[PDB]
């Protein structure tokens, strides 16, 4: 269940390939929504499989009246939830413009009910979302090891790792504030925090292994636009108090040009400028010599990311590694006239005369918590907890 170059491999000859890959000039990682189900998250099926259940009286307008979703997809639970929100956001602006008072209050309900199932699921904890020191817990234990291993496996002079993701949750920031690591994300300031797209070109140094880079392709819960025209970041406690305790526990959606998740308001020239600058950097990191990319958690149901990856194998120095835990069923289904675009796409490159590609399956053998353990610790790295027995002796001195 490990296919390189079209044919098979074994565990050791692949665990020895991983180690040689992590030692290249440029190293990166792409994550998805299936990586945060071991911490309190939910995939994209379970969201529609619950919207359907809780709001049936709205599921008829979308199909019989406005034609925004199809019946077989809704029954097989195969809908894209970002494009639906974008289209429903664009249907409301026209009505607000040309003064139609029915089609304006018919969409507020739809949008309020859609922005209420994805938020409740992106809170990995619950009412402890507003509190402090949340990366100290047990669910965020492998996220730490990922960063530790990605940083400690570099040499002096070699660049720093990169991280891309599609989630809009706070699981890698909580887990880095604890280690003592600093992540660049484009924003600067504390009392008025703003987006400057050149802070990705900076780095630290001492004057007497500190930092990394993070790219969020679909936004976050802490990003918003005010009565001004500028994007602002804030903390979780402040967001809970402004615009997150009303979404759930009320029925309010009148700020229709205000939120920046999950990829909704891309018709404004000020909010699309922040989405573009992330794909423009993905497609520029993925085009360098001596590059390696690990993928995990991602279902290949996006046309542009595939059209961007496929076009990078034309350079002989780019290598890929993929984890897909439902590979058997896909081969079966596309053996005899069937399957969806994702399965066809992955099977297309599973059969190739390309040693640059490597696919991994096996259900629980392709999950996040196994991806991590396949990565090496150095031999001179501190692991034994030899400082914790001593921080409570200072507390006993009450």
């Amino acid at each position: 269940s490990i296919y390189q170059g079209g044919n098979k491999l074994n565990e050791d000859d692949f665990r020895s390939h991983v180690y040689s890959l992590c030692q290249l000039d440029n190293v990166g990682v792409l994550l998805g929504a299936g990586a945060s189900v071991g911490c309190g998250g939910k995939t994209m099926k379970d969201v529609w499989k619950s919207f359907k259940q809780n709001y049936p009286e709205l599921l008829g307008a979308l199909i019989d009246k406005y034609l925004l979703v199809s019946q077989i997809d809704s029954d097989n639970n195969l809908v894209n939830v970002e494009l639906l929100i974008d289209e429903a956001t664009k249907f409301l602006s026209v009505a607000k413009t040309r003064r139609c008072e029915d089609e304006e209050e018919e969409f507020r309900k739809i949008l309020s009910s859609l922005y209420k199932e994805v938020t409740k699921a992106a809170l990995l904890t619950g009412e402890q979302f507003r509190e402090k020191n949340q990366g100290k817990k047990d669910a965020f234990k492998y996220h730490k090891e990922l960063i530790s291993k990605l940083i400690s496996n570099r040499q002096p002079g070699q660049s720093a790792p990169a991280i891309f993701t599609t989630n809009y949750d706070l699981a890698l920031e909580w887990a880095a504030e604890d280690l003592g690591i600093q992540l660049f994300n484009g924003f600067s300031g504390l009392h008025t925090r703003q987006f400057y797209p050149q802070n990705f070109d900076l780095a630290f140094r001492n004057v007497n292994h500190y930092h990394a880079y993070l790219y969020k392709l679909h936004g976050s819960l802490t990003w918003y636009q005010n009565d001004s025209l500028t994007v602002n970041e804030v903390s979780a406690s402040q967001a809970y108090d402004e615009y997150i305790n009303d979404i759930i526990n009320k029925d309010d959606f009148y700020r229709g040009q205000h939120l920046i998740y999950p990829g909704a308001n891309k018709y404004s020239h000020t909010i699309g400028f922040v989405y573009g600058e992330m794909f423009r950097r993905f497609g520029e990191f993925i085009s360098k010599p001596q590059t390696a990319l690990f993928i995990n958690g991602f279902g290949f149901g996006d046309y542009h990311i595939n059209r961007i990856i496929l076009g990078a194998l034309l350079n002989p120095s780019f290598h890929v590694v993929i984890y897909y835990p439902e590979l058997k069923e896909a081969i079966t289904k596309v053996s005899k006239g069937g399957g969806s675009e994702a399965e066809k796409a992955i099977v297309t490159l599973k059969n190739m005369a390309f040693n640059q590609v490597t696919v991994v399956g096996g259900g629980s053998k392709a999950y996040f918590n196994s991806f991590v353990e396949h990565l090496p610790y150095p031999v001179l790295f501190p692991r034994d907890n030899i400082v914790d027995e001593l921080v409570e002796a200072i507390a006993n001195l009450s």
Partner: protein, 83 residues
């Protein structure tokens, strides 16, 4: 508070000529002495063992020479094995 190791260094490699290894030391007693959670350890004269990081392995070596070039100091060593 993130640290890549707990035992500190003694110098850096600047040359390989066949089997030989060439080392340049840091300035001060930081290039001779050390102190860690377990005790005190030294490297003083020919006939002593030294180690190098290589990621997944640690290379072991024996010293042969030492000399001047405050002034700068050098070392020569040969390889024994790895852990």
């Amino acid at each position: 508070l993130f640290k890549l190791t707990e035992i500190s260094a003694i110098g850096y490699v600047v040359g390989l000529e066949g089997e030989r290894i060439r080392i340049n030391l840091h300035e001060g007693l930081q290039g001779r002495l050390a102190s860690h959670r377990k005790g005190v350890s030294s490297v003083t004269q020919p006939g002593d063992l030294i180690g190098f990081d290589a990621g997944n392995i640690l290379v072991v070596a024996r010293v042969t020479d030492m000399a001047f070039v405050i002034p700068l100091r050098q070392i020569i060593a040969y390889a024994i094995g790895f852990v």
